[PDB]
Amino acid sequence: MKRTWQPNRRKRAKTHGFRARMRTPGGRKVLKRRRQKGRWRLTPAVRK
Amino acid sequence: AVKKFKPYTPSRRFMTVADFSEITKTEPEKSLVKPLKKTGGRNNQGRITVRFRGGGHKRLYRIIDFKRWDKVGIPAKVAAIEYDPNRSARIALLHYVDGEKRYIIAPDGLQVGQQVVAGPDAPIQVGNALPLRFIPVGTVVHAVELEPKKGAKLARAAGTSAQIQGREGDYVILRLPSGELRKVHGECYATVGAVGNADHKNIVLGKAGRSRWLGRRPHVRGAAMNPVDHPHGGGEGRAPRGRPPASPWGWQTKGLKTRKRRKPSSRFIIARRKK
RNA sequence: UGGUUCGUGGAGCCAUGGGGGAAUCUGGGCGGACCACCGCCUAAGGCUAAGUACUCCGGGUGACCGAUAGCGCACCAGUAC
RNA sequence: GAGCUAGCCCUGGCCAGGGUGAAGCUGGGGUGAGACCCAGUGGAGGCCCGAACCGGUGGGGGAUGCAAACCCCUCGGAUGA
RNA sequence: GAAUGCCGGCAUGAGUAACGAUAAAGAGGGUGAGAAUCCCUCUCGCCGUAAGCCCAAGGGUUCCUACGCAAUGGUCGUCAGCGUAGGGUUAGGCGGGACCUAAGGUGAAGCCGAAAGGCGUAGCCGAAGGGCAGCCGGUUAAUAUUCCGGCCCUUCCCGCAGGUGCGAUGGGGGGACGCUCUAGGCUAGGGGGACCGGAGCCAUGGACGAGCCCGGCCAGAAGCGCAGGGUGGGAGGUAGGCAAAUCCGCCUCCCAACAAGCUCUGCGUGGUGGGGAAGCCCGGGUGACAACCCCCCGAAGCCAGGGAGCCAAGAAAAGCCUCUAAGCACAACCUGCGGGAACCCGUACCGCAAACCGACACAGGUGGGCGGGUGCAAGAGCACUCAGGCGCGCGGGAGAACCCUCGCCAAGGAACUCUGCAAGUUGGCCCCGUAACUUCGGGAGAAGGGGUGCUCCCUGGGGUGAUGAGCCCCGGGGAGCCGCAGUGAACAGGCUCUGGCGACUGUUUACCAAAAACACAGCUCUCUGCGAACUCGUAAGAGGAGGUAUAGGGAGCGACGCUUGCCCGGUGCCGGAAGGUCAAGGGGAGGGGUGCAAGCCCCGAACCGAAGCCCCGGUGAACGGCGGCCGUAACUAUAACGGUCCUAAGGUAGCGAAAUUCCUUGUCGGGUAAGUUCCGACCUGCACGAAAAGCGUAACGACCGGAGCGCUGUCUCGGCGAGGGACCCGGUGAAAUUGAACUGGCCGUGAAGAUGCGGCCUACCCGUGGCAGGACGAAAAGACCCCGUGGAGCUUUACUGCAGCC
RNA sequence: CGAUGUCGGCUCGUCGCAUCCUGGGGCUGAAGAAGGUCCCAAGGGUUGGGCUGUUCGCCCAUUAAAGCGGCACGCGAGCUG
RNA sequence: UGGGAGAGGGUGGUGGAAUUCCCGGAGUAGCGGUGAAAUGCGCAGAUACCGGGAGGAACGCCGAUGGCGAAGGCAGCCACCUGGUCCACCCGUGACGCUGAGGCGCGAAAGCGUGGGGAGCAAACCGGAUUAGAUACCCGGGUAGUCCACGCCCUAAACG
RNA sequence: CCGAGGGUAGGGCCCGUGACUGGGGCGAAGUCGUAACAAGGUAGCUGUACCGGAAGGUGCGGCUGGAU
RNA sequence: AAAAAUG
RNA sequence: GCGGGGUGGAGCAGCCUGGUAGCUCGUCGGGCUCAUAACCCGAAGGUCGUCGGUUCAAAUCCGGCCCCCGCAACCA
Ligand SMILES: [Mg+2]
Ligand SMILES: [Mg+2]
Ligand SMILES: [Mg+2]
Ligand SMILES: [Mg+2]
Ligand SMILES: [Mg+2]
Ligand SMILES: [Mg+2]
Ligand SMILES: [Mg+2]
Ligand SMILES: [Mg+2]
Ligand SMILES: [Mg+2]
Ligand SMILES: [Mg+2]
Ligand SMILES: [Mg+2]
Ligand SMILES: [Mg+2]
Ligand SMILES: [Mg+2]
Ligand SMILES: [Mg+2]
Ligand SMILES: [Mg+2]
Ligand SMILES: [Mg+2]
Ligand SMILES: [Mg+2]
Ligand SMILES: [Mg+2]
Ligand SMILES: [Mg+2]
Ligand SMILES: [Mg+2]
Ligand SMILES: [Mg+2]
Ligand SMILES: [Mg+2]
Ligand SMILES: [Mg+2]
Ligand SMILES: [Mg+2]
Ligand SMILES: [Mg+2]
Ligand SMILES: [Mg+2]
Ligand SMILES: [Mg+2]
Ligand SMILES: [Mg+2]
Ligand SMILES: [Mg+2]
Ligand SMILES: [Mg+2]
Ligand SMILES: [Mg+2]
Ligand SMILES: [Mg+2]
Ligand SMILES: [Mg+2]
Ligand SMILES: [Mg+2]
Ligand SMILES: [Mg+2]
Ligand SMILES: [Mg+2]
Ligand SMILES: [Mg+2]
Ligand SMILES: [Mg+2]
Ligand SMILES: [Mg+2]
Ligand SMILES: [Mg+2]
Ligand SMILES: [Mg+2]
Ligand SMILES: [Mg+2]
Ligand SMILES: [Mg+2]
Ligand SMILES: [Mg+2]
Ligand SMILES: [Mg+2]
Ligand SMILES: [Mg+2]
Ligand SMILES: [Mg+2]
Ligand SMILES: [Mg+2]
Ligand SMILES: [Mg+2]
Ligand SMILES: [Mg+2]
Ligand SMILES: [Mg+2]
Ligand SMILES: [Mg+2]
Ligand SMILES: [Mg+2]
Ligand SMILES: [Mg+2]
Ligand SMILES: [Mg+2]
Ligand SMILES: [Mg+2]
Ligand SMILES: [Mg+2]
Ligand SMILES: [Mg+2]
Ligand SMILES: [Mg+2]
Ligand SMILES: [Mg+2]
Ligand SMILES: [Mg+2]
Ligand SMILES: [Mg+2]
Ligand SMILES: [Mg+2]
Ligand SMILES: [Mg+2]
Ligand SMILES: [Mg+2]
Ligand SMILES: [Mg+2]
Ligand SMILES: [Mg+2]
Ligand SMILES: [Mg+2]
Ligand SMILES: [Mg+2]
Ligand SMILES: [Mg+2]
Ligand SMILES: [Mg+2]
Ligand SMILES: [Mg+2]
Ligand SMILES: [Mg+2]
Ligand SMILES: [Mg+2]
Ligand SMILES: [Mg+2]
Ligand SMILES: [Mg+2]
Ligand SMILES: [Mg+2]
Ligand SMILES: [Mg+2]
Ligand SMILES: [Mg+2]
Ligand SMILES: [Mg+2]
Ligand SMILES: [Mg+2]
Ligand SMILES: [Mg+2]
Ligand SMILES: [Mg+2]
Ligand SMILES: [Mg+2]
Ligand SMILES: [Mg+2]
Ligand SMILES: [Mg+2]
Ligand SMILES: [Mg+2]
Ligand SMILES: [Mg+2]
Ligand SMILES: [Mg+2]
Ligand SMILES: [Mg+2]
Ligand SMILES: [Mg+2]
Ligand SMILES: [Mg+2]
Ligand SMILES: [Mg+2]
Ligand SMILES: [Mg+2]
Ligand SMILES: [Mg+2]
Ligand SMILES: [Mg+2]
Ligand SMILES: [Mg+2]
Ligand SMILES: [Mg+2]
Ligand SMILES: [Mg+2]
Ligand SMILES: [Mg+2]
Ligand SMILES: [Mg+2]
Ligand SMILES: [Mg+2]
Ligand SMILES: [Mg+2]
Ligand SMILES: [Mg+2]
Ligand SMILES: [Mg+2]
Ligand SMILES: [Mg+2]
Ligand SMILES: [Mg+2]
Ligand SMILES: [Mg+2]
Ligand SMILES: [Mg+2]
Ligand SMILES: [Mg+2]
Ligand SMILES: [Mg+2]
Ligand SMILES: [Mg+2]
Ligand SMILES: [Mg+2]
Ligand SMILES: [Mg+2]
Ligand SMILES: [Mg+2]
Ligand SMILES: [Mg+2]
Ligand SMILES: [Mg+2]
Ligand SMILES: [Mg+2]
Ligand SMILES: [Mg+2]
Ligand SMILES: [Mg+2]
Ligand SMILES: [Mg+2]
Ligand SMILES: [Mg+2]
Ligand SMILES: [Mg+2]
Ligand SMILES: [Mg+2]
Ligand SMILES: [Mg+2]
Ligand SMILES: [Mg+2]
Ligand SMILES: [Mg+2]
Ligand SMILES: [Mg+2]
Ligand SMILES: [Mg+2]
Ligand SMILES: [Mg+2]
Ligand SMILES: [Mg+2]
Ligand SMILES: [Mg+2]
Ligand SMILES: [Mg+2]
Ligand SMILES: [Mg+2]
Ligand SMILES: [Mg+2]
Ligand SMILES: [Mg+2]
Ligand SMILES: [Mg+2]
Ligand SMILES: [Mg+2]
Ligand SMILES: [Mg+2]
Ligand SMILES: [Mg+2]
Ligand SMILES: [Mg+2]
Ligand SMILES: [Mg+2]
Ligand SMILES: [Mg+2]
Ligand SMILES: [Mg+2]
Ligand SMILES: [Mg+2]
Ligand SMILES: [Mg+2]
Ligand SMILES: [Mg+2]
Ligand SMILES: [Mg+2]
Ligand SMILES: [Mg+2]
Ligand SMILES: [Mg+2]
Ligand SMILES: [Mg+2]
Ligand SMILES: [Mg+2]
Ligand SMILES: [Mg+2]
Ligand SMILES: [Mg+2]
Ligand SMILES: [Mg+2]
Ligand SMILES: [Mg+2]
Ligand SMILES: [Mg+2]
Ligand SMILES: [Mg+2]
Ligand SMILES: [Mg+2]
Ligand SMILES: [Mg+2]
Ligand SMILES: [Mg+2]
Ligand SMILES: [Mg+2]
Ligand SMILES: [Mg+2]
Ligand SMILES: [Mg+2]
Ligand SMILES: [Mg+2]
Ligand SMILES: [Mg+2]
Ligand SMILES: [Mg+2]
Ligand SMILES: [Mg+2]
Ligand SMILES: [Mg+2]
Ligand SMILES: [Mg+2]
Ligand SMILES: [Mg+2]
Ligand SMILES: [Mg+2]
Ligand SMILES: [Mg+2]
Ligand SMILES: [Mg+2]
Ligand SMILES: [Mg+2]
Ligand SMILES: [Mg+2]
Ligand SMILES: [Mg+2]
Ligand SMILES: [Mg+2]
Ligand SMILES: [Mg+2]
Ligand SMILES: [Mg+2]
Ligand SMILES: [Mg+2]
Ligand SMILES: [Mg+2]
Ligand SMILES: [Mg+2]
Ligand SMILES: [Mg+2]
Ligand SMILES: [Mg+2]
Ligand SMILES: [Mg+2]
Ligand SMILES: [Mg+2]
Ligand SMILES: [Mg+2]
Ligand SMILES: [Mg+2]
Ligand SMILES: [Mg+2]
Ligand SMILES: [Mg+2]
Ligand SMILES: [Mg+2]
Ligand SMILES: [Mg+2]
Ligand SMILES: [Mg+2]
Ligand SMILES: [Mg+2]
């Protein structure tokens, strides 16, 4: 049947994207948390 | 002159539709229409403020002139009468001798191809619009400005009308379609006569379909929901309300007066609505 | 109403949202309701180093661990997944 | 977090074939004029039968399954909410 | 040493289940250390509205080539979507961007909010919508509408010539639209052809034939022709389209009006350029100087912005056109010609799947287009089949039980069973014929019958054409032939009678309930006069609504028919300038602290003081409620009547052992050989009852009862047969569970149900296929039950608060 | 209670004797036939339907008889639900 | 042809009297009602009297033993549309007539459907009296209806 | 070919019958009331409508077959 | 301008 | 199992707070009538379900028994 994940490259980059992050004080903190942790990718990647 | 249908389908038994007799023109005037933004009962927040609305047929809003003191003393010929999906009343196209064209709500008995004009000296004749103070007492009138130069706010529904019961000072006394007696300022313009399509209330829908076509989604009773959703909800089997019948927010819905007490308009209301 | 040990207590003092609203030293605040006496201090403008706090960073030292312990990671780790 | 699900808004797309034959219209009859009747044309419908498509009624199988909801027979709606 | 402990490792089950569709395989010839699994050929089977082909999303080198097989592939492996290395994605015209806008988002102005931030006209972003100029053929191992070949086309710049008041983000026009049906004329595509082109073929009884088989096109500028779309022309006046305006709008006059013309498409033709088979020979070559024509069927597609009808009344902006303003008319625009310029990103491959979403090379899920031929009434249905693509990545044997799925059956035909669950019966089309009842449509395909194939003869009409032939499409009558059976295979309702419920099509518990629940039109109450009421939000702001009492919110009932009685004492709501009660506050009789005192400070009565509450009334389609005991009639029995206590008032109509009836299988009747269910009645209704509506109702229902016919493996009552498993051999090889084991029966005992203790009996050691009584067998720290001063959701006249309102 | 699946039916049985039949008897108010009551006896047998979820029971039609009970109200790692 | 009468019918418009309610003034111990009372109303200011307003219904005197129509039925006034009927003159057509099974239409009041309207009156209902009881006659309240529009029902002591 | 007739299916009319139920008819002498004939003690009747243990009461309109 | 049944 | 009740012939107050049983109908006697009912005037009748206890005294307060109503009987 239809599962949960139906990938969409536009939706992904607009929802979890970097520019989406910077627009909310929470999303800013999201980046700040990940940079301090040291993750290699602050945002899900997508090719566009 | 509502039409019926033979009952060839069980929903078509009772269905009735308007005769569309008075309608002369099948398509509106392109210059006077603009897109109607369908809200779906949802505000700017995105939350539903009015439940169970949306999904109706698409509509183009037709601009209406509710301020005929705009073009004083400039006559106009009734070009045509068209169907407006945005209100109960039919509307009439006006071809001003000025060349400008406008829609006004179509009063009953207005015949295509007749002069209409606005101004304190306009003849008392169906379709002409005057300030209230210059209109003979007792005449039928509609499209009443509630306050001066703010646009017609009263008696715009199909078949409605307002009567004049007397004057007092600058104000004149109207009998509104609700029966209320309201002092309205004399300088408030108003269009003489009664609103057309007075057979609107006898339209029997026929089936749930026409509730959706008009954009009215299904309305689900309270006692059918659950405690978390509504006061009447819950209860084993069917059950009465067991409490004063109350809205989904708790305020009682059986004869509870809600109008704000200290409202300044109270000074200008003579008699509460009838019946 | 808040702060102080002070939870309305005899409840001051400091601070203040509302109302009313002075004085320039013979002016004014405080010493726990309030009064008198006796004292202290001069509100409604501002700046001020040092003493104190922390450890991403560098070093030194351990009756600290020794690859299931010690940071999650001694190794290409916030990686694989 | 509304890329699953629920509701709405914007913009597009889809529904083989067949059956029934409302109103209206034209002709004729009818009457003082009408209502009305008859045949033709007409092609209405949350109409009918039935694929796609959308469903998931009954039964069986499957039960460490092909599958954390599937498969077979059967069955409902299918120009409309 | 234990914590259903944590990490890791290795066992047990077990060489057992399984190897992921039952569409299917065999042989031969290569290669290779090795082959059922790789490659080639012939034979066979499977899809063919796909299991074929092309796009879009998603995926990200999986495409091609070479060399490789440890691991990945449910076996094997030389093979591959795996490993290594090399190569591969070419655009002014396809798509997107340098154009436009919709939701929505963002947001100079402005508004709001303790901070963070929330709104918001314009503007801007935003596409699978609008706008926009390329078609055919070839070529690479792999790219192509991208390279190449031919024939076309757009924009930008400069130059020139011709024409004109040129000029815009400002005005106007246009762009510009729904649903159902639909004309005419084309095209795609399809069928036949004794006509044309063709390598061959003569089989096994016949056929040298008007034979067999193959093929008989594609694109194409100007011009031409057929078919359609669109648009009237001039003059005058003008106060409107937020300046101007010749434009647009409005008025008046004149000529024209199914036209014509002018303009735009579509198709046909068109210089020319390509393509072009079967077969045979080793992807290529011939076939070939290939031919390339006629008739018919014909679209949902094109002309298109066509036409008619209808109610629910059917996007915006730009490109394009016109109008004029500053400006400027040495210019600028338009047309034509010439030369010059034309950028970024995507192009591989998979793409109903082994490459996407499902942990897997997963029987599931995934939007758009093409989707051929014949026959069956038609069709995207069913069967077979072209092009094309596959036999689903373990096999080989055996022919037990048992399971799955499928086929058949004597006589009986629901005796099965909770129930005809299931499986039978019926089945498509034509024609005759068809009941109660009904809201006149219906019920109705009701029911119930008959026909159905092929051949010869005769004969009506339609389309094309021409009016005819040809081809095609509908029928009619007669005469006959074969079979058990003629929709000869596949797809394709069993029917009837009577109840309860709900009016109806519809909706839901994704993932055990599709219902009698929800919704629905329709009825009633009730709120709201506009900056509405209500809702969301602290607000600003929104929705309501660019709506205005024929409108909008809330509540209950739920088509329609006939109806909806009595009670306002209590609660709710509505009304009520009296009175009572009432906080802050005003007031300050009168007392207190202290100072020598002027004074300072505190307590503080009567009275004045809103809502609310008390109080007076109203109100049922507001919450709710609608009795007991006793006597009495010329047989008895029962009470039309009466007596009495009480209540605010005591249940009317209609219904009633019901979805409700305890006693209950109440009693009588029907149906049956027999009826705790079903139907009709009766009424002493434990405990129906009138908008949590009362009683009914034609039609509708995968709803739930009862009955009958038809037919059946449901059953008496089982039997045979087929295939996939189960079994055997080769390859690969899990699982939960598991204290350890050398694990028998009985009679007792034991924490009260023993392989383990006592006595007695029986019993050689170890397995394979089977059966499920035991190991209180596995699985889940019982979900019922209580326990915890454990938790959570919900209710109100429980307590105390807060929003909101007064 | 870190689980002992709970009615009934189907299938498959096995045991007990307080025997329903058949067999052997005593007594009888046993003439015969046919019964009544007790005694011995468990080898075999103990039907088919209607209604109800039923167990039980009633009813139809038969029968030599249409027995009562145990085995976790036998039996769900056998099924139905 | 020329004239007369009439509540004959249909539409529109219009006048005053009164009742009820609302507002204003003024006023105080009761009003209302019956055979007599009581329910009801009234100091929360009624009745009675004045002024103003809203709204519906019906048309006093004329008026009659009167008139009109086929019947049921029709009554303020103004206008418009229109039927029936009588007198006069003796002009015209020249038996063209009378009744009328079916058929069609009209048809008081009550009743019904959909909307409208709603002062007064008033079935059903509530209450007060009478009574053995009073589901009545009488008093206090009161909904359908009575009224307008359209569409049904078509009955009668529709009787002279 | 026609055809008595037999079989199946669906309809039409008539008669008999049925738990129960509806009123109706009569039946020397039951119960409860008194509506009508006198102005029947509320004039009577009537069409209709609502209600009531029952006759009947009331509402709208009509007749006199109503007395004074 | 009519209080009040029956045999 | 819990709750309420039993008193003239019928239906009910008195019971809560001990001392005195009352209301309507009915029954009887007598009036009006031709006669009945209606109506008027008088009158009669209850040892309080039963038994036991408390108390100076029990319809009355406390126990037991009988009967008549009424409510509950749930999770399985
Ligand atoms: Mg789907
Ligand atoms: Mg996942
Ligand atoms: Mg999706
Ligand atoms: Mg996308
Ligand atoms: Mg977002
Ligand atoms: Mg890095
Ligand atoms: Mg109209
Ligand atoms: Mg927004
Ligand atoms: Mg948002
Ligand atoms: Mg709407
Ligand atoms: Mg919620
Ligand atoms: Mg709640
Ligand atoms: Mg409730
Ligand atoms: Mg409920
Ligand atoms: Mg209930
Ligand atoms: Mg409120
Ligand atoms: Mg105002
Ligand atoms: Mg504090
Ligand atoms: Mg000092
Ligand atoms: Mg001082
Ligand atoms: Mg101090
Ligand atoms: Mg300072
Ligand atoms: Mg400092
Ligand atoms: Mg160490
Ligand atoms: Mg060391
Ligand atoms: Mg080590
Ligand atoms: Mg470590
Ligand atoms: Mg570190
Ligand atoms: Mg590193
Ligand atoms: Mg590091
Ligand atoms: Mg979504
Ligand atoms: Mg057809
Ligand atoms: Mg048909
Ligand atoms: Mg037509
Ligand atoms: Mg047709
Ligand atoms: Mg349909
Ligand atoms: Mg059909
Ligand atoms: Mg169907
Ligand atoms: Mg399709
Ligand atoms: Mg669903
Ligand atoms: Mg299923
Ligand atoms: Mg199943
Ligand atoms: Mg499952
Ligand atoms: Mg189907
Ligand atoms: Mg739709
Ligand atoms: Mg092993
Ligand atoms: Mg094993
Ligand atoms: Mg095995
Ligand atoms: Mg196996
Ligand atoms: Mg199969
Ligand atoms: Mg081989
Ligand atoms: Mg494929
Ligand atoms: Mg490959
Ligand atoms: Mg290779
Ligand atoms: Mg390998
Ligand atoms: Mg391998
Ligand atoms: Mg090019
Ligand atoms: Mg852009
Ligand atoms: Mg833009
Ligand atoms: Mg700003
Ligand atoms: Mg914003
Ligand atoms: Mg586009
Ligand atoms: Mg393009
Ligand atoms: Mg090509
Ligand atoms: Mg390729
Ligand atoms: Mg090229
Ligand atoms: Mg110009
Ligand atoms: Mg056509
Ligand atoms: Mg064809
Ligand atoms: Mg040749
Ligand atoms: Mg031969
Ligand atoms: Mg012109
Ligand atoms: Mg102008
Ligand atoms: Mg201008
Ligand atoms: Mg061509
Ligand atoms: Mg051409
Ligand atoms: Mg050659
Ligand atoms: Mg088109
Ligand atoms: Mg147009
Ligand atoms: Mg069109
Ligand atoms: Mg045209
Ligand atoms: Mg339509
Ligand atoms: Mg339109
Ligand atoms: Mg723009
Ligand atoms: Mg200038
Ligand atoms: Mg490509
Ligand atoms: Mg597809
Ligand atoms: Mg593939
Ligand atoms: Mg996959
Ligand atoms: Mg596979
Ligand atoms: Mg798959
Ligand atoms: Mg699909
Ligand atoms: Mg197709
Ligand atoms: Mg096709
Ligand atoms: Mg086909
Ligand atoms: Mg055939
Ligand atoms: Mg067919
Ligand atoms: Mg198929
Ligand atoms: Mg058989
Ligand atoms: Mg047979
Ligand atoms: Mg049979
Ligand atoms: Mg049967
Ligand atoms: Mg049985
Ligand atoms: Mg069942
Ligand atoms: Mg079945
Ligand atoms: Mg019948
Ligand atoms: Mg029919
Ligand atoms: Mg039927
Ligand atoms: Mg048939
Ligand atoms: Mg044949
Ligand atoms: Mg043709
Ligand atoms: Mg021909
Ligand atoms: Mg033969
Ligand atoms: Mg079939
Ligand atoms: Mg069928
Ligand atoms: Mg039948
Ligand atoms: Mg339903
Ligand atoms: Mg349905
Ligand atoms: Mg479910
Ligand atoms: Mg679930
Ligand atoms: Mg289901
Ligand atoms: Mg708020
Ligand atoms: Mg707003
Ligand atoms: Mg409303
Ligand atoms: Mg309901
Ligand atoms: Mg109902
Ligand atoms: Mg009621
Ligand atoms: Mg009340
Ligand atoms: Mg009250
Ligand atoms: Mg004070
Ligand atoms: Mg004070
Ligand atoms: Mg107060
Ligand atoms: Mg109550
Ligand atoms: Mg007796
Ligand atoms: Mg009633
Ligand atoms: Mg009653
Ligand atoms: Mg029964
Ligand atoms: Mg019987
Ligand atoms: Mg049953
Ligand atoms: Mg029954
Ligand atoms: Mg009984
Ligand atoms: Mg009920
Ligand atoms: Mg109710
Ligand atoms: Mg019913
Ligand atoms: Mg009916
Ligand atoms: Mg029914
Ligand atoms: Mg049934
Ligand atoms: Mg049944
Ligand atoms: Mg069988
Ligand atoms: Mg086999
Ligand atoms: Mg052993
Ligand atoms: Mg034992
Ligand atoms: Mg031992
Ligand atoms: Mg076992
Ligand atoms: Mg087994
Ligand atoms: Mg536990
Ligand atoms: Mg549970
Ligand atoms: Mg255990
Ligand atoms: Mg267990
Ligand atoms: Mg014995
Ligand atoms: Mg023995
Ligand atoms: Mg014996
Ligand atoms: Mg004897
Ligand atoms: Mg004998
Ligand atoms: Mg035996
Ligand atoms: Mg035995
Ligand atoms: Mg039976
Ligand atoms: Mg029983
Ligand atoms: Mg015997
Ligand atoms: Mg037991
Ligand atoms: Mg039992
Ligand atoms: Mg058992
Ligand atoms: Mg089980
Ligand atoms: Mg077991
Ligand atoms: Mg069950
Ligand atoms: Mg089941
Ligand atoms: Mg007369
Ligand atoms: Mg003559
Ligand atoms: Mg006549
Ligand atoms: Mg009437
Ligand atoms: Mg009416
Ligand atoms: Mg009255
Ligand atoms: Mg009438
Ligand atoms: Mg015959
Ligand atoms: Mg015959
Ligand atoms: Mg009488
Ligand atoms: Mg009455
Ligand atoms: Mg008597
Ligand atoms: Mg007594
Ligand atoms: Mg007492
Ligand atoms: Mg006494
Ligand atoms: Mg006496
Ligand atoms: Mg005593
Ligand atoms: Mg005493
Ligand atoms: Mg419970």
Numbering used by the authors:
A (entry chain 17): 1 to 48
B (entry chain 1D): 2 to 276
Give the authors' words:
During protein synthesis, ribosomes discriminate chirality of amino acids and prevent incorporation of D-amino acids into nascent proteins by slowing down the rate of peptide bond formation. To provide structural insights into the poor reactivity of the D-aminoacyl-tRNAs in the peptide bond formation we determined the crystal structure of T. thermophilus 70S ribosomes in complex with hydrolysis-resistant analogs of aminoacyl-tRNAs. We used cytidyl-cytidyl-puromycin (CC-Pmn) as an L-aminoacyl-tRNA analog that carried L-methyl-tyrosine residue (L-mTyr) and adenyl-cytidyl-cytidyl-adenylyl-D-phenylalanine (ACCA-D-Phe) as a D-aminoacyl-tRNA analog that carried D-phenylalanine residue (D-Phe). Using either of these compounds as an A-site substrate, we determined their crystal structures in complex with the T. thermophilus 70S ribosomes carrying messenger RNA and tRNAifMet in the P site.
To overcome this limitation, we determined the crystal structure of the 70S ribosome in complex with the D-aminoacyl-tRNA mimic, 73ACCA76-D-phenylalanine (ACCA-D-Phe), bound to the ribosomal A site. Our structure reveals that the D-aminoacyl-tRNA analog binds the ribosome in a similar fashion as L-aminoacyl-tRNAs with the CCA-end binding the ribosomal A site in a canonical way and with the D-amino acid side chain accommodated by the ribosomal side chain-binding pocket. The side chain of the D-phenylalanine was also visible in the electron density map, although only up to the Cγ atom, pointing to the partial flexibility of the D-amino acid side chain. The position of the Cγ atom of the D-phenylalanine side chain and the fact that the bulky side chain of D-Phe should tightly fit into the A-site cleft indicates that the D-Phe side chain is fully accommodated into the A-site cavity because any other orientation of the tip of D-Phe side chain would result in collisions with the surrounding rRNA nucleotides. By contrast, in our structure of ribosome-bound ACCA-D-Phe substrate, the α-amino group of the D-amino acid is directed not towards, but away from the P-site tRNA. In this orientation, the α-amino group is unlikely to form such H-bond due to the at least 3.5Å distance between the α-amino group and the 2′-OH group of the P-site tRNA and unfavorable geometry. As a result, the nucleophilic attack from this position is likely to be less efficient due to the larger distance between the reactive α-amino group and the carbonyl carbon of the P-site substrate (dashed arrowhead). Also, a defined path for abstraction of the proton from the attacking α-amine is not arranged, which might be another reason for the decreased reactivity of the D-amino acid residues during the peptide bond formation reaction. We found that if the reactive α-amino group of the D-amino acid is positioned for the optimal nucleophilic attack onto the carbonyl carbon of the P-site substrate, then the side chain would clash with the universally conserved nucleotide U2506 in the PTC.
